[PDB]
Design a protein around this nucleic acid. Structure first.
Ligand SMILES: [Mg+2]
Ligand SMILES: [Mg+2]
Ligand SMILES: [Mg+2]
Ligand SMILES: [Mg+2]
Ligand SMILES: [Mg+2]
Ligand SMILES: [Mg+2]
Ligand SMILES: [Mg+2]
Ligand SMILES: [Mg+2]
Ligand SMILES: [Mg+2]
Ligand SMILES: [Mg+2]
Ligand SMILES: [Mg+2]
Ligand SMILES: [Mg+2]
Ligand SMILES: [Mg+2]
Ligand SMILES: [Mg+2]
Ligand SMILES: [Mg+2]
Ligand SMILES: [Mg+2]
Ligand SMILES: [Mg+2]
Ligand SMILES: [Mg+2]
Ligand SMILES: [Mg+2]
Ligand SMILES: [Mg+2]
Ligand SMILES: [Mg+2]
Ligand SMILES: [Mg+2]
Ligand SMILES: [Mg+2]
Ligand SMILES: [Mg+2]
Ligand SMILES: [Mg+2]
Ligand SMILES: [Mg+2]
Ligand SMILES: [Mg+2]
Ligand SMILES: [Mg+2]
Ligand SMILES: [Mg+2]
Ligand SMILES: [Mg+2]
Ligand SMILES: [Mg+2]
Ligand SMILES: [Mg+2]
Ligand SMILES: [Mg+2]
Ligand SMILES: [Mg+2]
Ligand SMILES: [Mg+2]
Ligand SMILES: [Mg+2]
Ligand SMILES: [Mg+2]
Ligand SMILES: [Mg+2]
Ligand SMILES: [Mg+2]
Ligand SMILES: [Mg+2]
Ligand SMILES: [Mg+2]
Ligand SMILES: [Mg+2]
Ligand SMILES: [Mg+2]
Ligand SMILES: [Mg+2]
Ligand SMILES: [Mg+2]
Ligand SMILES: [Mg+2]
Ligand SMILES: [Mg+2]
Ligand SMILES: [Mg+2]
Ligand SMILES: [Mg+2]
Ligand SMILES: [Mg+2]
Ligand SMILES: [Mg+2]
Ligand SMILES: [Mg+2]
Ligand SMILES: [Mg+2]
Ligand SMILES: [Mg+2]
Ligand SMILES: [Mg+2]
Ligand SMILES: [Mg+2]
Ligand SMILES: [Mg+2]
Ligand SMILES: [Mg+2]
Ligand SMILES: [Mg+2]
Ligand SMILES: [Mg+2]
Ligand SMILES: [Mg+2]
Ligand SMILES: [Mg+2]
Ligand SMILES: [Mg+2]
Lengths: 156, 222, 185, 53, 51, 148
RNA sequence: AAAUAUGUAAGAAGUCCUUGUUACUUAAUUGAACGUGGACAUUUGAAUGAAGAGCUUUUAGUGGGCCAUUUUUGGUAAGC
RNA sequence: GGAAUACUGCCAGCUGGGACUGAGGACUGCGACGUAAGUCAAGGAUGCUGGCAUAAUGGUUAUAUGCCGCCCGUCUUGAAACACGGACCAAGGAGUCUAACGUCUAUGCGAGUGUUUGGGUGUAAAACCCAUACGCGUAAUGAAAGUGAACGUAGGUUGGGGCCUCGCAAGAGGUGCACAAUCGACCGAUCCUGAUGUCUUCGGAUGGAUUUGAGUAAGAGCAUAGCUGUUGGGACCCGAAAG
RNA sequence: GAAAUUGUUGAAAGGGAAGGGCAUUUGAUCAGACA
């Protein structure tokens, strides 16, 4: 031989895992995140876009809407840590939302159902936005840090 | 073949018996400590009332932390640091105060800080960095059965028993206190409060008896 | 750093195995370490360690020294154990019965023992008859009889035998050895 | 001290033990109350420097 | 295999020392003391404020 | 074999285990047994008291042989009888038929008396005896017969 | 006449009772030395510590030293 | 008069932001929460989602940039030294063998041990076999002539592992090898004593002594081999002026 | 048919030496593992 055989080999038997104790418990959101609250998206495709928050989804994400007809953002998932919660606020009591969950956004262009859903949720919101002057205009402009803005000082 | 639970019976039950004894025992100490504290408070007040002066008993127990490294140390203080079990910087141990140990403390003032520990800091020393010596082998406390297996002989069958033995400097302070490994502390988190450690506490330095100010140090180091 | 107070990394200083390379010896050791771990019998711990011993620390026990021991009060029926070799001794004329267990019996020792209707036994036959070493009498031979130790501790007034090759008058017996030749030792 | 020990050993024992006859070091002081009666505290200060010579 | 600080880890807090449960339960860490009012002798005061 | 030898282990270190200061030089002590009475005296006295000077008488042309005279103690003595033959004599401690032992034939010169023979007659032929050996021999009912 | 240094002691190899041995020793069965028999146990005789203690053999290198605080000699002094 | 606050201390009061780590691999423990079923943050990380599946991450390498980095070897108290060797590279280049030894260890056999000068024999410098001696050991001590190791269970005392007996156990007693300490006895030397006796000067019993020995006191050796150490040898390698 | 040392070719750096350490950028190069 070129090399002597080893005298002992490892077993090829793979152990099982120890019985880990790590309960998945529900994520409670920072108190600033109540539905109706306008969010500033900090990252991603719609970064800088100001948007309305609708529902906390079962995968911890946030359901938001532009409204699409205001600024072009659809019903969409958004990650709660990439969001600045502002202090301005629309009532969201005429918006259904029961429908929407994780599977609704399963990967599986745009299905008519989605397009229709957007109209049903947005006409409700739009009704509400119009109640406070300039809110719609506010909702169309992107957020942007200006020279000498200090996020650790600014109130949102 | 029973045993399955049929000797888990005896065991589970008997363990419950023991926590019971520990509960009644810990509730006892709590009373003991409160009325001790209050009596001296009312001692001091009664005396003022009477136009007099209540001088507390002298402290029976100190806690010593080595503050100096391992180099350039003269032989007499050196042997004493060893006998007190302080062979590395920031380690610490308890010392019951008598003339025959007082003079040891005297001989090592340049290299240690010490003072009179309160219940809170003895409690938190043991809860967090308290290890027994067991066939040597420095073993973490973490469960009461460890204590009772090794000190049960002297009464003392829980962690808070251990503490009660230390703080009252009970009849078995030698065995109890030797049982604890030297506490291994970190550097103070606040810092030392002084520009230079190696002067006495009294001269704006760090060593010597600093009496009750030992607790702030130790906590910042624990 | 640590103000150490004893050498670090210090070996205990006791053999742990024998230094011998002998299968059978190593097997007897397999036997007795098992016996030592799984019985609380002190006998087995002692025997374990003796097997580790080197030749010096295993002087031979003689059959006459064996006989002497059996003369102990309440001891004639004890089975004697020698962890080493057992030599013969024409100097005794009447040797008793008993059972000796040892590592080695010389031709003549075995004879003497067996001719008195005794029994020579190996340490493992010993193990099966007496797992807690019940009823046993462990004998060791004389260690400090060895020719070597005649010269340990050589020095003035110690009285202890020169390392010398030829001997006689005229070999290290003058100046320093007698009052009239400088001095004495 | 040996003779003494033997005494209070037998001496006690006969009563019904409870001895303690190892020597013990100077203990620290226990509490105590000091009165002021006939003994109000005298106040001293440090004193100025001076020569006398 | 991993030392857990009773001081933070209620679980092992309560494993060692079962009194902890009631200590907390009864607050005890904030015991109100009996409000008595003894007053110090003028002697005590006089000499506190002396020179 | 060189294989196991410390000089294999010293390759690569400068001084070969012999020191940077003290070095390995040719003959610092001097050669051989030099210095005996001078710089090597502490080791000679101690370890070798007796070395220098003389004692007793010179003997020119001493023929070792003249003094050939091995000792055998009663200690043994019975060993000079072959064991099969031996057991037979022990049993029948007896005049009229006691064993003859030619110790000279066995190659001994003197019989000495180390310790206790059985209480059995022996006839012991030897060149010399210690007073004691003869005594013990006789107390077993035996005799020494002086040969040459 | 200090301070710092330094000898010994803090028991089971201990203490107490009874009374054997000798050629030593006493006026003396007096002593002295060594003992037999009996009585008392881990608060059995201060503290602190002890990753144990004791012991034996054999052999290397070394046998230019230098420095700091304090004590300190010579020297005016010196990185003497 | 009646409060508040500061300061110091305590809580097994609650709670937010941030960093590093996730060792282990069925179960087994100590617990906690529940009326319970069951649950858990209780003897070491899992759940959910995405992107890439390639030089992307990672290795190697050159370069650049931050900070760091004096020439090795040597003797020396102290070397980067304004101390010495060394321009460069290959190849060679220094504790060996032998006689005789000390300690230790392994192995054979053991009061013995050592076949190898020789002989026998052979598949021929091998392997196998062997008689007589000899060497070391089993006796010491004296300059020598010489003498030559049991009062005694081969002794007493103290400690001793182990074993034995009692006890559920803790303990108590019995025996006690090795080893250690101590007091004795035995052999030789030296000194004293000097019985029974005698080719009247030989003989030297017996009992002793702050003397003395590398001794006895139920043997431990002999041989082969190894590391280390010792002496003689060119003697770790290289070097005189000389004779 | 090694090395010292040399010619050419290719690539790179170079404000009074060069070489080295920890680290990363950049360039060049390459292993593995995936299904
Ligand atoms: Mg779980
Ligand atoms: Mg939450
Ligand atoms: Mg728009
Ligand atoms: Mg200093
Ligand atoms: Mg301590
Ligand atoms: Mg802090
Ligand atoms: Mg800080
Ligand atoms: Mg702070
Ligand atoms: Mg400063
Ligand atoms: Mg800390
Ligand atoms: Mg001998
Ligand atoms: Mg000899
Ligand atoms: Mg050799
Ligand atoms: Mg070799
Ligand atoms: Mg090698
Ligand atoms: Mg080496
Ligand atoms: Mg090395
Ligand atoms: Mg090397
Ligand atoms: Mg080295
Ligand atoms: Mg060397
Ligand atoms: Mg050199
Ligand atoms: Mg000579
Ligand atoms: Mg002293
Ligand atoms: Mg201790
Ligand atoms: Mg230990
Ligand atoms: Mg040496
Ligand atoms: Mg030396
Ligand atoms: Mg020397
Ligand atoms: Mg020198
Ligand atoms: Mg893991
Ligand atoms: Mg793991
Ligand atoms: Mg691709
Ligand atoms: Mg690849
Ligand atoms: Mg890619
Ligand atoms: Mg580079
Ligand atoms: Mg630099
Ligand atoms: Mg040099
Ligand atoms: Mg110089
Ligand atoms: Mg210079
Ligand atoms: Mg030179
Ligand atoms: Mg040069
Ligand atoms: Mg070469
Ligand atoms: Mg053949
Ligand atoms: Mg031939
Ligand atoms: Mg043949
Ligand atoms: Mg022949
Ligand atoms: Mg001989
Ligand atoms: Mg003999
Ligand atoms: Mg002779
Ligand atoms: Mg004569
Ligand atoms: Mg005696
Ligand atoms: Mg006993
Ligand atoms: Mg006895
Ligand atoms: Mg004598
Ligand atoms: Mg003499
Ligand atoms: Mg001799
Ligand atoms: Mg040499
Ligand atoms: Mg020449
Ligand atoms: Mg010449
Ligand atoms: Mg000449
Ligand atoms: Mg060619
Ligand atoms: Mg390049
Ligand atoms: Mg790099």
């Amino acid at each position: 031989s070129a090399q002597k055989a080893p005298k002992w080999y490892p077993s090829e038997d793979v152990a099982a895992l120890k019985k880990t104790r790590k309960a998945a418990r529900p994520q409670k959101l920072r108190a600033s995140l109540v539905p109706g609250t306008v969010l500033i998206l900090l990252a991603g495709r719609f970064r800088g876009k100001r948007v309305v928050y609708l529902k906390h989804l079962e995968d911890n994400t946030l359901l938001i809407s532009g409204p699409f007809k205001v600024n072009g953002v659809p019903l969409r998932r958004v990650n709660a840590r990439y969001v600045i919660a502002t202090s301005t606020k629309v009532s969201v009591e005429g918006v259904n939302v029961e429908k929407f969950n994780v599977e609704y956004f399963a990967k599986e262009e745009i299905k008519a159902e989605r397009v229709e859903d957007q109209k049903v949720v947005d006409k409700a919101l739009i009704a509400e936005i119009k109640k406070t002057p300039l809110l719609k205009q506010y909702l169309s402009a992107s957020f942007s840090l200006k020279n000498g803005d200090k996020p650790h000082m600014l109130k949102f | 073949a029973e045993q399955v639970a049929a000797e888990r019976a005896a065991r589970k039950a008997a363990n419950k018996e023991k926590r019971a004894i520990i509960l009644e025992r810990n509730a006892a100490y709590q009373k003991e400590y409160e009325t001790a504290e209050r009596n001296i408070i009312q001692a001091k007040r009664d005396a003022k009332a009477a136009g007099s002066y209540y001088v507390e008993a002298q402290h029976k127990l100190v806690f010593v932390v080595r503050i100096k490294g391992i180099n350039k140390i003269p032989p007499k203080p050196r042997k004493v640091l060893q006998l007190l079990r302080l062979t590395r910087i920031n380690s610490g141990t308890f010392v019951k105060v008598t003339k025959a140990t007082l003079e040891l403390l005297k001989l090592i003032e340049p290299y240690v800080a010490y003072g009179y520990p309160s219940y809170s800091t003895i409690r938190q020393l043991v809860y967090k960095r308290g290890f027994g010596k067991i066939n040597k082998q420095r073993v973490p406390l973490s469960d009461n059965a460890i204590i009772e297996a090794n000190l049960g002989k002297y009464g003392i069958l829980s962690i808070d028993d251990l503490i009660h033995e230390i703080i009252t400097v009970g009849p078995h302070f030698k065995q109890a206190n030797n049982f604890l490994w030297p506490f291994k502390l970190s550097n103070p988190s606040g810092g030392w409060g002084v520009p230079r450690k190696f002067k006495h506490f009294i001269q704006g330095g760090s060593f010597g008896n600093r009496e009750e100010f030992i607790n702030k140090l130790v906590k910042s180091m624990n | 750093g640590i103000d150490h107070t004893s050498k670090q990394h210090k070996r205990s200083g006791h053999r742990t195995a024998p230094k011998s390379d002998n299968v059978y010896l190593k097997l007897l050791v397999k036997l007795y370490t098992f016996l030592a771990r799984r019985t609380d019998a002190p006998f087995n711990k002692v025997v374990l360690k003796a097997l580790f011993l080197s030749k010096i620390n295993r002087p031979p026990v003689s059959v006459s020294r064996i006989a002497r021991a059996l003369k102990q009060e309440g001891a004639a029926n004890k089975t004697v154990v020698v962890v080493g070799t057992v030599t013969d001794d024409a100097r005794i004329f009447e040797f008793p019965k008993t059972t000796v267990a040892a590592l080695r019996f010389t031709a003549g020792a075995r004879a003497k023992i067996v001719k008195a209707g005794g029994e020579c036994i190996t340490l493992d036959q010993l193990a099966v008859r007496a797992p807690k070493g019940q009823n046993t009498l462990i004998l060791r031979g004389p260690r400090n009889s060895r020719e070597a130790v005649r010269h340990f501790g050589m020095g003035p007034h110690k009285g202890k035998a020169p390392r010398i090759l030829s001997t006689g008058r005229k070999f290290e017996r003058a100046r320093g050895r007698r009052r009239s030749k400088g001095f004495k030792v | 001290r040996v003779k003494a020990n033997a005494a209070k050993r037998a001496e006690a024992k006969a009563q019904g033990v409870a001895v303690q006859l190892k020597r013990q070091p100077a203990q620290p002081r226990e509490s105590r109350i000091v009165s002021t009666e006939g003994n109000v505290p005298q106040t001293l200060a440090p004193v100025p420097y001076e020569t006398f010579i | 295999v991993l030392k857990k600080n009773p001081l933070k880890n209620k679980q092992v807090l309560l494993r060692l020392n079962p009194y902890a449960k009631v200590f907390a339960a009864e607050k005890l860490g904030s015991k109100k003391a009996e409000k008595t009012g003894t007053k110090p002798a003028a002697v005590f005061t006089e000499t506190l404020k002396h020179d | 074999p060189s294989r196991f030898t410390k000089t294999r282990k010293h390759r690569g270190h400068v001084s070969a285990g012999k020191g940077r200061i003290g070095k390995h030089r040719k003959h610092p002590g001097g050669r051989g047994m030099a210095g005996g009475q001078h710089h090597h005296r502490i080791n000679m006295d101690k370890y070798h008291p007796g070395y220098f000077g003389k004692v007793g008488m010179r003997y020119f042309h001493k023929q070792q042989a003249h003094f050939w005279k091995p000792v055998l103690n009663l200690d043994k003595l019975w060993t000079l009888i072959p064991e099969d033959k031996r057991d037979q004599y022990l049993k029948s401690a007896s005049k009229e038929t006691a064993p003859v032992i030619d110790t000279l034939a066995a190659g001994y010169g003197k019989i000495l008396g180390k310790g206790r023979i059985p209480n059995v007659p022996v006839i012991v032929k030897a060149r010399f005896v210690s007073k004691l050996a003869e005594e013990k021999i006789r107390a077993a009912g035996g005799v020494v017969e002086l040969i040459a």
